[PDB]
């Protein structure tokens, strides 16, 4: 669930997802349209694409399981659908951490809407 | 720290996953100027004032101590400066939660900046 996704960002990226990734670029935030503006923005585009390929459960409200093996996050596989949800959040959290080197809020925080008007890239 | 502030929002508002406070009104988000547009927005104005009235520690990166006795967040530790930071966060979180009935993101999410170019009133 979004609550877990939110907690995963703090655990893996060791940063606040609400105050650093809820209005970034063209896809980091609710919804999304246009083209991802950078690496962090592509992470969100992929996450949106991931949630959209999940069938058999709800990626926003359904809760999944996960543990910590060696400071890393492992998703529970007992329930097949929910593991697919965890993977979407897990892969996004790691994507944010690996791209911190180029995180550019100075430019993309509250990025003008006119910049995200193009038709979105296919998933 | 921002991570703790976010964690306190998740714990108090019990719905921090769908109610964001990163770009709401004139004061819920980075910076702040003009005047509170509503109740939630006033919660952020008072919070910004609370962070501005602190010296001796950093409210952004310093971590404070706190417990969850029952359902409340009790600020503790043995540092007046950090317990101050915790109180700024504790109050704001409750404020957000007590004003959920008025939360209006349809209107105030990504509120145009030109609507906040008035000089702010004193704290
Ligand atoms: Ca999005
Ligand atoms: Ca503010
Ligand atoms: Zn379109």
């Amino acid at each position: 669930s979004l609550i877990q996704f939110e907690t995963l960002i703090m655990k893996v990226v060791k940063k606040s997802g609400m105050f650093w990734y809820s209005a970034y670029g063209c896809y980091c935030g609710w919804g999304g349209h246009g083209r991802p503006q950078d690496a962090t923005d592509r992470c969100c585009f992929v996450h949106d694409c991931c949630y959209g390929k999940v069938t058999g459960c709800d990626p926003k409200m359904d809760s999944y399981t996960y543990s910590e093996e060696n400071g890393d996050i492992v998703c529970g596989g007992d329930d097949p659908c929910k593991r697919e949800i965890c993977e979407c959040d897990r892969v996004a959290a790691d994507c944010f951490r690996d791209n911190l080197d180029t995180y550019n809020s100075d430019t993309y925080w509250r990025y003008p809407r006119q910049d995200c008007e193009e038709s979105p890239e296919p998933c």
Side-chain angles (χ1 to χ4, degrees), chain A residues 88-100:
Chain A
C88 285
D89 293 344
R90 191 216 127 223
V91 173
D94 267 280
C95 189
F96 288 154
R97 181 203 62 195
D98 288 359
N99 291 290
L100 279 174

Side-chain angles (χ1 to χ4, degrees), chain A residues 4 63-67 73-78 82-83 86:
Chain A
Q4 293 179 300
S63 306
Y64 50 75
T65 295
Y66 64 85
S67 51
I73 298 297
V74 320
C75 293
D78 292 333
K82 295 182 170 182
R83 200 230 173 223
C86 179

Side-chain angles (χ1 to χ4, degrees), chain A residues 23-38 41-42 44-45 48 107-118 120-121:
Chain A
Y24 189 100
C26 287
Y27 285 90
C28 295
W30 207 265
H33 194 275
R35 281 207 76 179
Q37 303 300 120
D38 66 354
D41 209 22
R42 187 165 250 291
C44 296
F45 169 85
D48 275 33
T107 307
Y108 307 113
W109 185 258
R110 288 192 66 158
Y111 197 53
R113 302 92 184 296
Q114 55 189 294
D115 295 320
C116 313
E117 277 173 357
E118 305 147 6
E121 283 188 17

